[PDB]
Design a binder for this molecule. Structure first.
Ligand SMILES: CN1CCN(CCCN2c3ccccc3Sc3ccc(C(F)(F)F)cc32)CC1
Ligand SMILES: CN1CCN(CCCN2c3ccccc3Sc3ccc(C(F)(F)F)cc32)CC1
Ligand SMILES: CN1CCN(CCCN2c3ccccc3Sc3ccc(C(F)(F)F)cc32)CC1
Ligand SMILES: CN1CCN(CCCN2c3ccccc3Sc3ccc(C(F)(F)F)cc32)CC1
Ligand SMILES: [Ca+2]
Ligand SMILES: [Ca+2]
Ligand SMILES: [Ca+2]
Ligand SMILES: [Ca+2]
Lengths: 93, 93
C-alpha cells in the first residue's frame, strides 16, 4: 500500500527495461533512449519526435560524454522533470 | 497508461501532501518529514526508529541547514534511494 515506494520501483525498473536491450546492459544508447522516451514519457516528448530533437536530448543528458545515458544521468533527467512539476504546485512564482 | 509519468506524479505530489500542513507550505519541517517517511517510505525507515537516526536523516536531507527539506532536497533523497535500488539490478559489484 505504498504509492511512493511503487513509484521508485517503476522509475528504476523502467530504466532497465530498455537499458538491457543492446550493448552495455546498464546504459541507454540512442536507440534505447528513444524507445524509453517515446513509450514511457510521451507527454514530455509530445508532438516533437524528429531526429534533431533526440540529438539535443542525448546531448543534454550525456554529461560525461561517453555517448550513453547511465543511471545517474537518467536520475538527473527525471529530477529535472520533477522540478518542472513542482513549479505547478508553487503557483508558478 | 504511462507508469513512469504516473510515478513522477506520485513523487512530486507526495511531497506536497505533507509540505503544506505547517509553516512554510513548500517545505517539510522535522514533523512533516517524519510523517512522510513513516507513512510513505516505511520499508526505508523500519519500525521503532530512535531520534539520533532521524536527526541524522534530517541533517543529511537538509543540505542548506535551514532546518527544513525543500523540494530540491527531497529530489536528492529520492534519487539516492533510486541509486541504491539500481545496485540490485547492477552487479552490486
Ligand atoms: C494523461 N494525462 C496527460 C497529462 N499529464 C500531466 C502532464 C503534466 N504533468 C504534471 C504537471 C504538474 C504536476 C504534476 C504533473 S505529473 C507529470 C509527470 C510527467 C510529466 C512529463 F510528461 F512531462 F513527463 C508531466 C506531468 C497527466 C496524465
Ligand atoms: C511536446 N512537449 C509537451 C510538453 N512540454 C513540456 C512543458 C515544459 N516542462 C518541462 C520543461 C523542461 C523539462 C521537462 C519538462 S516536463 C514538464 C512537466 C510539467 C510542467 C508543468 F507542470 F509546468 F506543466 C512543465 C514541464 C515539452 C514539449
Ligand atoms: C512490501 N514490499 C517491501 C519491500 N519492497 C522492496 C524493498 C527494496 N526495494 C527495491 C530494491 C531493489 C529494486 C527495486 C526496489 S523497489 C524499492 C523502492 C523503495 C525502497 C525504499 F524503501 F527503500 F524506499 C525499497 C525498494 C517491495 C514491497
Ligand atoms: C529499516 N531499514 C531497512 C532498509 N535499510 C536501507 C539500507 C539499504 N538501502 C539504502 C541505503 C542508503 C540510502 C537509501 C537506501 S534505500 C535502499 C533501496 C534498495 C536497496 C537494495 F536494492 F539494495 F536492496 C538498498 C537500500 C535501512 C534500514
Ligand atoms: Ca544498453
Ligand atoms: Ca553518459
Ligand atoms: Ca511545511
Ligand atoms: Ca533545507
Amino acid at each position: 500500500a505504498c504509492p511512493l515506494e511503487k513509484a521508485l520501483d517503476v522509475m528504476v525498473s523502467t530504466f532497465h527495461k530498455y537499458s538491457g536491450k543492446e550493448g552495455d546492459k546498464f546504459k541507454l544508447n540512442k536507440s534505447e533512449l528513444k524507445e524509453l522516451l517515446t513509450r514511457e514519457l510521451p507527454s514530455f516528448l509530445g508532438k516533437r519526435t524528429d531526429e534533431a530533437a533526440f540529438q539535443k536530448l542525448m546531448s543534454n543528458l550525456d554529461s560525461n560524454r561517453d555517448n550513453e545515458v547511465d543511471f545517474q544521468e537518467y536520475c538527473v533527467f527525471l529530477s529535472c522533470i520533477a522540478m518542472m512539476c513542482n513549479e505547478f504546485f508553487e503557483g508558478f512564482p
